[PDB]
Amino acid sequence: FVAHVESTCLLDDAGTPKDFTYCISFNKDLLTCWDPEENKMAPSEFGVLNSLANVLSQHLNQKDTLMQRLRNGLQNCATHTQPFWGSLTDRTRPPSVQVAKTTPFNTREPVMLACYVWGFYPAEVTITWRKNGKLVMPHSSAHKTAQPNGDWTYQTLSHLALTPSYGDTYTCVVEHIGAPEPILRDWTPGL
Amino acid sequence: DLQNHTFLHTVYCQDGSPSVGLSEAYDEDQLFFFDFSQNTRVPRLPEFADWAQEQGDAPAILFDKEFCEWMIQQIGPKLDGKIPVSRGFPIAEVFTLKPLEFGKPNTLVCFVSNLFPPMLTVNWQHHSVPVEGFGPTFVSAVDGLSFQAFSYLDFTPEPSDIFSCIVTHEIDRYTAIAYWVPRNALPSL
Ligand SMILES: *[C@@H]1O[C@H](CO)[C@@H](O)[C@H](O)[C@H]1NC(C)=O
């Protein structure tokens, strides 16, 4: 079996706790959490094996040492989070971006450009396209959330399908919070 | 009007290896994971925690540890055989950290999702040949009571390179395999 004691801390970009939960699970079943309104360790929702969680309400709830820290609750996060918190809402790395042809997929068009976009934090990022200065739609419409790299950097891409004419200049626009200025990358058929 | 953020302190335990762990993660990237041999918080890469293992709260941790371990200890056998054990089969994919430029130094990321229970060993193979990878394997706790993990292989891309990432799920020696080949290489400048 596996068991969890999950504490979530929810605080806005400044550093104030808007909510906080203390849940207890066993075998990927959510068993007992903290109810701030009634100030108790009540079992979460209902359950087929909740009786264990109901008994899990009695062991605990017999511990004022604990039972106080749950009353403390929200502010305990700010107390726990204040040292690093600033820098983490402050942590921000701009996204290197590059444009190159990729193998065309799902298209009658002969050329497909990928605008790769990597090494950034946070992951919120927006990528659009332009042809000769004006704004066109991108290839997919399904919103791809960026893929975590596991080392606090993220990455992603957008595609664009065109029939080439050398007079044209296609441009890819990246709006990370990392930069104050939109990053552009031009592409021309004779590049 | 201000965007919200989640810092999750996840205390976990299980039968087998490891017996106990503790991942804390801000925004689904972890900064810390605990060490119970050394009673200290080991850092991921957020410039390696200048604040680090502030000992400012062992009461919280050491309490959750013993209780978790009680649930595995005294609740385990009473329920063993009566309700089924929750398990997923882990999913592995490998992509490049940076864009693919032939002959230019890169890294291979092996992203393991759907890890439950969190016990695994990951091996890299280059043309089906066992090859050591940079760093250790980072297991992180994620929302919804599951786990993920990362591994990394530095290398220089050749047009012919074939790599594979192999995940062993330690609960019954199950394996997932994920292949990599160079695709859509950007022009070398
Ligand atoms: C931020 O989080 C709180 C709950 O913690 C929620 O009530 C509030 O609506 C959220 N703010 C926004 C802008 O969604």
Side-chain angles (χ1 to χ4, degrees), chain A residues 1-7 9-12 22 24-28 52 56 59 66 69 80 84 88 91 98 100 102-103 116 118 121 147-152 154-155, chain B residues 2 4-15 26 29-30 41 44 51 60 64 67-68 71 75 84-86 96-97 99 111 116-117 144-145 150 152 184 186:
Chain A
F1 301 102
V2 183
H4 304 68
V5 199
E6 177 156 304
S7 290
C9 281
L10 213 179
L11 313 83
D12 71 357
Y22 189 69
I24 282 198
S25 297
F26 182 90
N27 200 35
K28 204 148 189 302
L52 184 56
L56 271 183
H59 184 5
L66 168 95
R69 87 180 223 170
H80 183 338
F84 51 99
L88 285 183
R91 173 176 265 261
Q98 185 169 347
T102 200
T103 298
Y116 312 94
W118 72 103
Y121 190 104
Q147 165 73 65
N149 296 112
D151 62 15
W152 288 69
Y154 285 73
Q155 65 159 110
Chain B
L2 267 43
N4 283 293
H5 297 239
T6 293
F7 170 92
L8 69 120
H9 201 63
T10 349
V11 199
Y12 64 99
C13 27
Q14 60 164 334
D15 332 285
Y26 162 74
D29 296 276
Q30 58 149 230
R41 296 151 112 100
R44 189 52 178 101
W51 42 102
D64 292 327
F67 177 65
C68 214
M71 278 185 298
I75 305 285
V85 163
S86 301
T96 39
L97 175 52
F111 178 40
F116 194 105
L145 303 180
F150 294 80
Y152 297 101
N184 299 289
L186 301 72

Coordinates of all heavy atoms in Angstrom, one line a residue, chain A residues 1-7 9-13 22 24-28 52 56 59 66 69 80 84 88 91 98 100 102-103 116 118 121 147-152 154-155, chain B residues 2-15 26 29-30 41 44 51 60 64 67-68 71 75 84-86 96-97 99 111 116-117 144-145 150 152 184 186, unseen atoms left out:
Chain A
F1 N 0.8 -1.2 0.0 CA 0.0 0.0 0.0 C 0.8 1.3 0.0 O 2.0 1.2 0.3 CB -1.0 0.0 1.2 CG -1.9 -1.1 1.2 CD1 -1.6 -2.2 2.1 CD2 -3.0 -1.2 0.4 CE1 -2.5 -3.3 2.1 CE2 -3.8 -2.3 0.4 CZ -3.6 -3.3 1.2
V2 N 0.2 2.4 -0.3 CA 0.8 3.7 -0.2 C 0.0 4.6 0.6 O -1.3 4.5 0.6 CB 1.0 4.3 -1.6 CG1 1.8 5.7 -1.4 CG2 1.8 3.4 -2.5
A3 N 0.5 5.4 1.4 CA -0.2 6.4 2.2 C 0.3 7.8 2.1 O 1.5 8.0 2.0 CB -0.3 6.0 3.7
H4 N -0.6 8.8 2.1 CA -0.2 10.2 2.1 C -0.7 11.0 3.2 O -1.8 10.7 3.8 CB -0.8 10.9 0.8 CG -0.4 10.2 -0.5 ND1 -0.9 8.9 -0.8 CD2 0.4 10.6 -1.5 CE1 -0.3 8.5 -2.0 NE2 0.4 9.5 -2.4
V5 N 0.0 12.1 3.5 CA -0.4 13.1 4.4 C -0.1 14.5 3.7 O 0.9 15.1 3.8 CB 0.3 13.1 5.8 CG1 -0.5 13.9 6.8 CG2 0.5 11.7 6.2
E6 N -1.1 14.9 2.9 CA -0.9 16.0 1.9 C -1.4 17.3 2.5 O -2.5 17.5 2.9 CB -1.7 15.7 0.6 CG -1.7 16.8 -0.4 CD -1.9 16.3 -1.8 OE1 -1.1 15.4 -2.2 OE2 -2.8 16.7 -2.5
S7 N -0.4 18.2 2.6 CA -0.7 19.6 3.0 C -0.6 20.5 1.8 O 0.5 20.6 1.2 CB 0.2 20.1 4.1 OG -0.1 19.4 5.3
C9 N -0.7 24.4 0.2 CA -0.6 25.8 0.6 C -0.9 26.7 -0.6 O -0.2 26.7 -1.6 CB 0.7 26.2 1.3 SG 0.7 25.7 3.0
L10 N -2.0 27.6 -0.5 CA -2.5 28.3 -1.6 C -2.4 29.8 -1.2 O -3.1 30.4 -0.4 CB -4.0 28.0 -1.8 CG -4.6 28.0 -3.2 CD1 -6.1 27.6 -3.0 CD2 -4.5 29.4 -3.8
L11 N -1.4 30.5 -1.9 CA -1.2 31.9 -1.5 C -0.9 32.7 -2.8 O -0.1 32.3 -3.7 CB 0.1 32.0 -0.6 CG 0.2 31.1 0.6 CD1 0.7 29.7 0.3 CD2 1.0 31.7 1.8
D12 N -1.6 33.9 -2.9 CA -1.5 34.7 -4.1 C -0.1 35.3 -4.3 O 0.8 35.2 -3.4 CB -2.6 35.8 -4.1 CG -2.3 36.9 -3.0 OD1 -1.3 36.8 -2.3 OD2 -3.1 37.9 -3.0
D13 N 0.2 35.9 -5.4 CA 1.5 36.3 -5.8 C 2.3 37.2 -4.8 O 3.5 37.3 -4.9 CB 1.5 37.0 -7.2
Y22 N -5.6 20.0 4.9 CA -4.8 18.9 5.5 C -5.5 17.5 5.3 O -6.2 17.1 6.2 CB -4.6 19.2 7.0 CG -3.6 18.3 7.7 CD1 -2.2 18.3 7.3 CD2 -4.0 17.3 8.6 CE1 -1.3 17.5 8.0 CE2 -3.1 16.5 9.2 CZ -1.7 16.6 8.9 OH -0.8 15.7 9.5
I24 N -5.7 13.3 4.4 CA -5.0 12.1 4.7 C -5.6 10.9 3.9 O -6.8 10.6 4.0 CB -5.2 11.8 6.2 CG1 -4.2 12.6 7.0 CG2 -4.9 10.3 6.5 CD1 -4.0 12.1 8.4
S25 N -4.8 10.3 3.1 CA -5.2 9.2 2.2 C -4.5 7.9 2.4 O -3.4 7.9 3.0 CB -5.1 9.7 0.7 OG -5.9 10.8 0.5
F26 N -5.0 6.8 1.9 CA -4.4 5.5 2.1 C -4.8 4.6 1.0 O -6.0 4.3 0.9 CB -4.8 4.9 3.4 CG -4.1 3.5 3.7 CD1 -2.9 3.4 4.3 CD2 -4.8 2.4 3.3 CE1 -2.3 2.2 4.6 CE2 -4.2 1.1 3.6 CZ -2.9 1.1 4.2
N27 N -3.9 4.1 0.2 CA -4.2 3.4 -1.0 C -4.9 4.2 -2.1 O -5.9 3.7 -2.7 CB -5.0 2.1 -0.7 CG -4.9 1.0 -1.8 OD1 -3.9 0.9 -2.4 ND2 -6.0 0.3 -1.9
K28 N -4.4 5.4 -2.3 CA -5.0 6.3 -3.3 C -6.5 6.5 -3.1 O -7.2 6.7 -4.1 CB -4.6 5.9 -4.7 CG -4.6 7.0 -5.7 CD -3.6 6.8 -6.8 CE -3.5 8.0 -7.7 NZ -4.8 8.4 -8.3
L52 N -12.6 3.3 8.5 CA -11.2 3.5 8.7 C -10.9 5.0 8.9 O -10.2 5.4 9.9 CB -10.3 2.9 7.6 CG -8.8 2.9 7.8 CD1 -8.4 2.2 9.1 CD2 -8.1 2.3 6.6
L56 N -10.0 7.0 11.9 CA -8.8 7.9 11.7 C -9.2 9.4 12.1 O -8.3 10.2 12.2 CB -8.4 7.9 10.2 CG -7.3 6.9 9.9 CD1 -6.9 7.0 8.4 CD2 -6.1 7.0 10.8
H59 N -8.3 8.9 16.3 CA -6.9 9.0 16.5 C -6.6 10.2 15.6 O -6.9 10.1 14.4 CB -6.2 7.7 16.0 CG -4.7 7.7 16.2 ND1 -4.0 8.7 16.9 CD2 -3.7 6.8 15.8 CE1 -2.7 8.4 16.9 NE2 -2.5 7.3 16.3
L66 N -1.4 18.7 17.6 CA -1.9 18.8 16.2 C -3.0 19.8 16.1 O -2.9 20.8 15.5 CB -2.3 17.4 15.7 CG -3.1 17.5 14.3 CD1 -2.1 17.2 13.2 CD2 -4.3 16.5 14.3
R69 N -2.3 23.3 15.5 CA -1.7 23.6 14.2 C -2.7 23.7 13.0 O -2.4 24.5 12.1 CB -0.6 22.6 13.9 CG -1.0 21.4 13.1 CD 0.1 20.4 12.8 NE 0.1 19.9 11.4 CZ 1.1 19.2 10.8 NH1 2.2 19.0 11.5 NH2 0.9 18.8 9.6
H80 N 5.9 29.6 7.1 CA 6.7 28.6 6.5 C 7.3 29.1 5.1 O 8.4 28.7 4.8 CB 5.9 27.3 6.2 CG 6.7 26.2 5.6 ND1 7.8 26.3 4.9 CD2 6.4 24.9 5.6 CE1 8.3 25.2 4.5 NE2 7.4 24.2 4.9
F84 N 11.7 32.0 1.1 CA 11.9 31.8 -0.3 C 10.8 32.4 -1.2 O 11.1 32.7 -2.4 CB 12.0 30.3 -0.6 CG 11.0 29.4 0.0 CD1 9.9 29.0 -0.7 CD2 11.0 29.1 1.4 CE1 8.9 28.3 -0.2 CE2 10.0 28.3 1.9 CZ 8.9 27.9 1.2
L88 N 10.5 33.2 -5.5 CA 9.8 32.2 -6.4 C 8.6 32.8 -7.2 O 8.3 32.4 -8.3 CB 9.2 31.0 -5.5 CG 10.2 30.0 -5.0 CD1 9.4 28.9 -4.3 CD2 11.0 29.4 -6.2
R91 N 11.0 34.5 -9.5 CA 11.7 33.7 -10.4 C 11.2 33.8 -11.8 O 10.0 33.5 -12.0 CB 11.8 32.3 -10.0 CG 12.5 31.4 -11.0 CD 12.7 29.9 -10.6 NE 14.0 29.7 -10.1 CZ 15.0 29.1 -10.8 NH1 14.8 28.8 -12.0 NH2 16.2 28.9 -10.2
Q98 N 13.7 29.9 -31.8 CA 14.3 29.7 -33.1 C 13.3 29.1 -34.1 O 12.4 28.4 -33.7 CB 15.5 28.8 -33.0 CG 16.3 28.6 -34.2 CD 17.7 28.0 -34.0 OE1 18.2 27.9 -32.9 NE2 18.3 27.6 -35.1
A100 N 12.6 27.1 -37.9 CA 13.2 26.3 -38.9 C 12.1 25.4 -39.5 O 11.1 25.2 -38.9 CB 14.3 25.4 -38.3
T102 N 10.0 22.2 -40.5 CA 9.8 20.9 -39.9 C 9.0 20.1 -40.9 O 8.4 20.6 -41.9 CB 9.0 21.0 -38.6 OG1 9.3 19.8 -37.8 CG2 7.5 21.1 -38.7
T103 N 9.0 18.8 -40.8 CA 8.2 17.9 -41.7 C 6.7 18.2 -41.6 O 6.1 18.0 -40.5 CB 8.5 16.4 -41.5 OG1 9.9 16.2 -41.8 CG2 7.7 15.6 -42.4
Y116 N 10.1 26.9 -32.4 CA 10.5 26.3 -31.1 C 10.7 27.4 -30.1 O 11.1 28.5 -30.4 CB 11.7 25.4 -31.2 CG 11.6 24.4 -32.4 CD1 12.2 24.8 -33.6 CD2 11.0 23.2 -32.3 CE1 12.2 23.9 -34.7 CE2 11.0 22.3 -33.4 CZ 11.6 22.7 -34.6 OH 11.6 21.8 -35.7
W118 N 12.0 27.5 -26.0 CA 12.5 26.7 -24.8 C 13.2 27.5 -23.7 O 13.4 28.7 -23.8 CB 13.4 25.6 -25.3 CG 14.7 26.0 -25.7 CD1 15.9 25.9 -25.0 CD2 15.0 26.6 -27.0 NE1 16.9 26.5 -25.8 CE2 16.4 26.9 -27.0 CE3 14.2 26.9 -28.1 CZ2 17.0 27.5 -28.1 CZ3 14.9 27.5 -29.2 CH2 16.3 27.8 -29.2
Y121 N 10.7 30.2 -17.7 CA 9.9 30.0 -16.4 C 9.3 31.4 -16.2 O 10.0 32.4 -16.2 CB 10.7 29.6 -15.3 CG 9.9 29.2 -14.0 CD1 9.7 27.9 -13.7 CD2 9.3 30.2 -13.2 CE1 8.9 27.5 -12.6 CE2 8.5 29.8 -12.2 CZ 8.3 28.5 -11.9 OH 7.5 28.2 -10.8
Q147 N 5.5 21.8 -21.8 CA 6.0 20.6 -21.1 C 7.1 20.9 -20.2 O 8.1 21.6 -20.6 CB 6.6 19.6 -22.2 CG 7.4 18.5 -21.6 CD 6.6 17.4 -20.9 OE1 5.8 16.7 -21.5 NE2 6.9 17.3 -19.6
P148 N 7.0 20.6 -18.9 CA 8.0 20.8 -17.9 C 9.3 20.0 -18.2 O 9.3 18.9 -18.7 CB 7.4 20.2 -16.6 CG 6.0 19.8 -16.9 CD 5.7 20.3 -18.3
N149 N 10.5 20.6 -18.0 CA 11.7 19.9 -18.2 C 12.2 19.3 -16.9 O 13.2 18.5 -16.9 CB 12.8 20.8 -18.8 CG 12.5 21.3 -20.2 OD1 12.2 22.5 -20.3 ND2 12.4 20.5 -21.2
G150 N 11.5 19.6 -15.8 CA 11.9 19.0 -14.5 C 12.9 19.8 -13.8 O 13.2 19.5 -12.6
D151 N 13.6 20.7 -14.5 CA 14.6 21.6 -13.8 C 14.2 23.0 -13.8 O 15.0 23.9 -14.0 CB 16.0 21.3 -14.4 CG 16.1 21.7 -15.9 OD1 15.2 22.3 -16.5 OD2 17.2 21.3 -16.5
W152 N 12.9 23.3 -13.6 CA 12.3 24.6 -13.5 C 12.3 25.5 -14.8 O 12.0 26.6 -14.8 CB 12.9 25.4 -12.3 CG 12.4 24.9 -11.0 CD1 12.7 23.7 -10.4 CD2 11.5 25.5 -10.1 NE1 12.1 23.5 -9.2 CE2 11.3 24.7 -9.0 CE3 10.9 26.8 -10.1 CZ2 10.5 25.0 -7.9 CZ3 10.0 27.1 -9.0 CH2 9.9 26.2 -7.9
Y154 N 10.8 25.3 -19.0 CA 9.7 24.7 -19.7 C 10.0 24.8 -21.2 O 10.9 25.5 -21.6 CB 8.4 25.3 -19.4 CG 7.8 24.9 -18.1 CD1 8.4 25.4 -16.9 CD2 6.7 24.1 -18.0 CE1 7.9 25.0 -15.7 CE2 6.2 23.7 -16.7 CZ 6.8 24.2 -15.6 OH 6.3 23.8 -14.4
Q155 N 9.2 24.2 -22.1 CA 9.3 24.3 -23.5 C 8.1 24.1 -24.3 O 7.1 23.5 -23.8 CB 10.5 23.4 -24.0 CG 10.2 21.9 -23.9 CD 11.0 21.1 -24.8 OE1 11.9 20.4 -24.4 NE2 10.7 21.2 -26.1
Chain B
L2 N -5.2 38.8 -8.4 CA -3.8 38.2 -8.3 C -3.8 36.7 -8.6 O -4.6 36.0 -7.9 CB -3.2 38.5 -7.0 CG -2.3 39.8 -6.8 CD1 -2.9 41.0 -7.5 CD2 -2.1 40.1 -5.4
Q3 N -3.0 36.2 -9.5 CA -2.9 34.8 -9.8 C -2.5 33.9 -8.6 O -1.5 34.3 -7.9 CB -2.0 34.6 -11.0
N4 N -3.1 32.8 -8.4 CA -2.9 31.9 -7.3 C -1.7 30.9 -7.5 O -1.3 30.7 -8.7 CB -4.2 31.3 -6.8 CG -5.1 32.2 -6.0 OD1 -4.7 32.6 -4.9 ND2 -6.2 32.5 -6.5
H5 N -1.2 30.4 -6.4 CA 0.0 29.5 -6.5 C -0.1 28.4 -5.5 O -0.6 28.6 -4.4 CB 1.3 30.3 -6.2 CG 1.6 31.4 -7.2 ND1 2.8 31.4 -7.9 CD2 0.9 32.5 -7.6 CE1 2.8 32.4 -8.7 NE2 1.7 33.1 -8.5
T6 N 0.4 27.2 -5.8 CA 0.3 26.1 -4.9 C 1.6 25.5 -4.5 O 2.5 25.1 -5.3 CB -0.6 24.9 -5.5 OG1 -1.9 25.4 -5.6 CG2 -0.5 23.7 -4.6
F7 N 1.9 25.5 -3.2 CA 3.1 24.9 -2.6 C 2.6 23.6 -1.9 O 1.9 23.7 -0.8 CB 3.8 25.8 -1.6 CG 4.9 25.2 -0.8 CD1 6.2 25.2 -1.2 CD2 4.6 24.6 0.4 CE1 7.2 24.6 -0.5 CE2 5.6 24.0 1.2 CZ 6.9 24.0 0.7
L8 N 2.9 22.4 -2.4 CA 2.4 21.2 -1.8 C 3.4 20.4 -1.1 O 4.3 19.8 -1.7 CB 1.4 20.4 -2.7 CG 1.9 19.7 -3.9 CD1 1.6 18.2 -3.7 CD2 1.2 20.3 -5.1
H9 N 3.3 20.2 0.2 CA 4.1 19.4 1.1 C 3.5 18.0 1.2 O 2.5 17.8 1.8 CB 4.2 20.1 2.5 CG 5.3 19.6 3.3 ND1 6.6 19.9 2.9 CD2 5.4 18.9 4.5 CE1 7.5 19.4 3.8 NE2 6.7 18.8 4.8
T10 N 4.1 17.1 0.5 CA 3.5 15.8 0.4 C 4.3 14.8 1.2 O 5.5 14.5 0.9 CB 3.4 15.3 -1.1 OG1 3.6 16.4 -2.0 CG2 2.0 14.8 -1.4
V11 N 3.7 14.2 2.2 CA 4.3 13.2 3.1 C 3.8 11.8 2.6 O 2.6 11.5 2.8 CB 4.0 13.4 4.5 CG1 5.0 12.7 5.4 CG2 4.0 14.9 4.9
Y12 N 4.7 10.9 2.2 CA 4.2 9.6 1.7 C 5.0 8.4 2.3 O 6.2 8.6 2.7 CB 4.2 9.6 0.2 CG 5.5 9.7 -0.5 CD1 6.2 8.6 -1.0 CD2 6.1 11.0 -0.8 CE1 7.4 8.7 -1.7 CE2 7.3 11.1 -1.4 CZ 8.0 9.9 -1.9 OH 9.2 10.0 -2.5
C13 N 4.4 7.3 2.3 CA 5.0 6.0 2.7 C 4.4 4.8 2.1 O 3.2 4.8 1.7 CB 5.1 5.9 4.2 SG 3.8 6.8 5.1
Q14 N 5.1 3.7 2.1 CA 4.7 2.4 1.5 C 5.5 1.2 1.9 O 6.5 1.3 2.5 CB 4.9 2.6 0.0 CG 6.3 2.9 -0.4 CD 6.5 2.6 -1.9 OE1 5.8 1.9 -2.5 NE2 7.5 3.3 -2.4
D15 N 5.0 0.0 1.5 CA 5.7 -1.2 1.7 C 6.7 -1.4 0.6 O 6.4 -1.3 -0.6 CB 4.7 -2.4 1.7 CG 3.3 -2.1 2.2 OD1 3.1 -1.9 3.4 OD2 2.4 -2.0 1.3
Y26 N 6.5 23.6 -5.5 CA 5.8 24.8 -5.9 C 5.4 24.8 -7.3 O 6.3 24.6 -8.2 CB 6.6 26.1 -5.5 CG 6.2 27.3 -6.2 CD1 5.1 28.0 -5.8 CD2 7.0 27.9 -7.2 CE1 4.7 29.2 -6.4 CE2 6.6 29.1 -7.8 CZ 5.5 29.7 -7.4 OH 5.1 30.9 -8.1
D29 N 6.6 22.1 -9.9 CA 8.1 21.9 -9.9 C 8.4 21.8 -8.4 O 8.0 22.6 -7.6 CB 8.8 23.1 -10.5 CG 8.4 23.3 -11.9 OD1 9.1 22.7 -12.8 OD2 7.6 24.2 -12.2
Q30 N 9.2 20.8 -8.1 CA 9.6 20.7 -6.7 C 10.9 21.4 -6.4 O 11.8 21.5 -7.2 CB 9.8 19.2 -6.3 CG 10.8 18.5 -7.2 CD 11.6 17.4 -6.4 OE1 12.8 17.4 -6.4 NE2 10.8 16.5 -5.8
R41 N 16.4 18.7 4.5 CA 15.8 18.9 3.2 C 16.9 19.0 2.1 O 17.6 20.0 2.1 CB 14.9 20.1 3.3 CG 13.7 20.0 4.2 CD 13.3 21.4 4.8 NE 12.0 21.8 4.3 CZ 10.9 21.7 5.0 NH1 10.9 21.2 6.2 NH2 9.7 22.1 4.5
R44 N 16.5 20.5 -4.9 CA 16.5 20.3 -6.4 C 17.4 21.4 -6.9 O 18.4 21.7 -6.3 CB 15.0 20.4 -6.8 CG 14.7 20.1 -8.2 CD 15.2 18.7 -8.6 NE 14.8 18.4 -10.0 CZ 15.6 18.5 -11.1 NH1 16.8 18.8 -10.9 NH2 15.1 18.2 -12.3
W51 N 18.7 29.1 1.5 CA 17.9 29.0 2.8 C 17.9 27.5 3.2 O 17.9 27.2 4.4 CB 16.5 29.6 2.6 CG 15.9 29.2 1.3 CD1 15.0 28.2 1.1 CD2 16.2 29.8 0.0 NE1 14.6 28.2 -0.3 CE2 15.4 29.1 -0.9 CE3 17.0 30.8 -0.4 CZ2 15.4 29.5 -2.3 CZ3 17.0 31.2 -1.8 CH2 16.2 30.5 -2.7
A60 N 6.5 19.4 12.5 CA 5.5 19.0 11.5 C 5.9 17.8 10.8 O 5.1 16.8 10.8 CB 5.3 20.2 10.5
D64 N 4.2 13.7 10.9 CA 3.6 13.1 9.7 C 4.3 11.8 9.3 O 3.6 10.8 8.9 CB 3.6 14.1 8.5 CG 2.6 15.2 8.8 OD1 1.6 15.1 9.5 OD2 2.9 16.4 8.3
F67 N 3.2 8.8 11.7 CA 1.8 8.5 11.6 C 1.6 7.7 10.3 O 0.9 6.7 10.2 CB 1.0 9.7 11.5 CG -0.5 9.4 11.4 CD1 -1.2 8.7 12.3 CD2 -1.2 9.8 10.2 CE1 -2.5 8.4 12.1 CE2 -2.5 9.5 10.0 CZ -3.2 8.8 11.0
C68 N 2.3 8.2 9.2 CA 2.2 7.6 7.9 C 2.8 6.2 8.1 O 2.2 5.2 7.5 CB 3.1 8.4 7.0 SG 2.5 8.4 5.3
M71 N 0.3 3.9 9.6 CA -0.7 3.4 8.7 C -0.2 2.3 7.8 O -1.0 1.3 7.5 CB -1.2 4.6 7.8 CG -2.2 5.5 8.5 SD -2.8 6.7 7.4 CE -1.3 7.6 7.0
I75 N -2.1 -0.7 9.8 CA -3.3 -0.8 8.9 C -3.1 -1.7 7.7 O -4.0 -2.4 7.2 CB -3.7 0.6 8.4 CG1 -4.0 1.6 9.5 CG2 -5.0 0.5 7.5 CD1 -5.3 1.3 10.2
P84 N -8.3 -4.3 -2.9 CA -7.2 -4.4 -3.8 C -6.2 -3.2 -3.7 O -6.5 -2.2 -3.3 CB -8.0 -4.3 -5.2 CG -9.1 -3.4 -4.9 CD -9.5 -3.8 -3.5
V85 N -5.0 -3.5 -4.2 CA -3.9 -2.5 -4.1 C -3.9 -1.5 -5.3 O -3.9 -2.0 -6.5 CB -2.5 -3.1 -3.9 CG1 -1.4 -2.2 -4.2 CG2 -2.4 -3.7 -2.4
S86 N -4.0 -0.2 -5.1 CA -4.0 0.7 -6.1 C -2.6 0.8 -6.9 O -1.6 0.9 -6.2 CB -4.3 2.1 -5.6 OG -5.6 2.1 -5.0
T96 N 14.2 16.1 -26.3 CA 15.4 16.9 -26.1 C 15.1 18.2 -25.3 O 14.0 18.8 -25.5 CB 16.1 17.2 -27.5 OG1 15.1 17.5 -28.5 CG2 16.9 16.1 -27.9
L97 N 16.0 18.5 -24.5 CA 15.9 19.7 -23.7 C 15.9 21.0 -24.5 O 15.1 21.9 -24.4 CB 17.1 19.8 -22.6 CG 17.2 21.0 -21.7 CD1 15.9 21.4 -21.0 CD2 18.3 20.8 -20.7
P99 N 16.5 22.5 -28.8 CA 16.2 22.1 -30.2 C 17.4 21.3 -30.7 O 18.5 21.5 -30.4 CB 16.1 23.4 -30.9 CG 15.5 24.3 -29.9 CD 16.2 24.0 -28.7
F111 N 10.9 11.6 -19.3 CA 9.8 12.0 -18.4 C 8.9 10.8 -18.1 O 8.3 10.3 -19.0 CB 9.0 13.1 -19.1 CG 7.9 13.6 -18.2 CD1 8.0 13.6 -16.8 CD2 6.7 13.9 -18.7 CE1 7.0 14.0 -16.0 CE2 5.6 14.2 -17.9 CZ 5.8 14.3 -16.6
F116 N 2.8 5.0 -9.8 CA 2.2 4.7 -8.6 C 2.2 3.1 -8.5 O 1.7 2.4 -9.3 CB 0.8 5.2 -8.5 CG 0.2 5.1 -7.1 CD1 0.1 6.3 -6.4 CD2 -0.3 4.0 -6.6 CE1 -0.5 6.3 -5.1 CE2 -0.8 3.9 -5.3 CZ -1.0 5.1 -4.6
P117 N 2.9 2.6 -7.4 CA 3.5 3.3 -6.3 C 4.8 3.8 -6.8 O 5.3 3.4 -7.8 CB 3.7 2.2 -5.3 CG 3.9 1.0 -6.1 CD 3.0 1.1 -7.3
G144 N -3.2 14.9 -7.0 CA -4.1 13.8 -7.2 C -3.5 12.5 -6.7 O -3.9 11.4 -7.1
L145 N -2.5 12.6 -5.8 CA -1.9 11.4 -5.2 C -1.1 10.5 -6.2 O -1.0 9.3 -5.9 CB -2.9 10.6 -4.4 CG -3.7 11.3 -3.3 CD1 -4.7 10.2 -2.7 CD2 -2.9 11.9 -2.3
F150 N 12.1 12.3 -13.3 CA 12.9 12.7 -14.4 C 14.3 12.0 -14.4 O 14.8 11.7 -13.3 CB 13.1 14.2 -14.4 CG 11.9 15.0 -14.7 CD1 10.9 15.2 -13.7 CD2 11.6 15.5 -16.0 CE1 9.8 15.9 -14.0 CE2 10.4 16.2 -16.2 CZ 9.5 16.4 -15.2
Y152 N 18.1 12.0 -17.1 CA 18.8 12.9 -18.1 C 20.0 12.3 -18.7 O 20.8 11.6 -17.9 CB 19.2 14.2 -17.4 CG 18.1 15.1 -16.9 CD1 17.7 15.1 -15.6 CD2 17.3 15.8 -17.8 CE1 16.7 15.8 -15.1 CE2 16.2 16.6 -17.3 CZ 15.9 16.6 -16.0 OH 14.9 17.4 -15.5
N184 N 13.6 16.2 -37.5 CA 13.4 17.6 -37.9 C 14.5 18.5 -37.4 O 14.2 19.7 -37.0 CB 12.0 18.1 -37.4 CG 10.9 17.3 -38.1 OD1 10.6 17.4 -39.3 ND2 10.2 16.4 -37.3
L186 N 17.2 21.1 -37.0 CA 17.4 22.5 -37.5 C 18.7 22.6 -38.3 O 19.7 21.9 -37.9 CB 17.4 23.5 -36.4 CG 16.2 23.7 -35.5 CD1 16.1 22.5 -34.5 CD2 16.3 24.9 -34.7

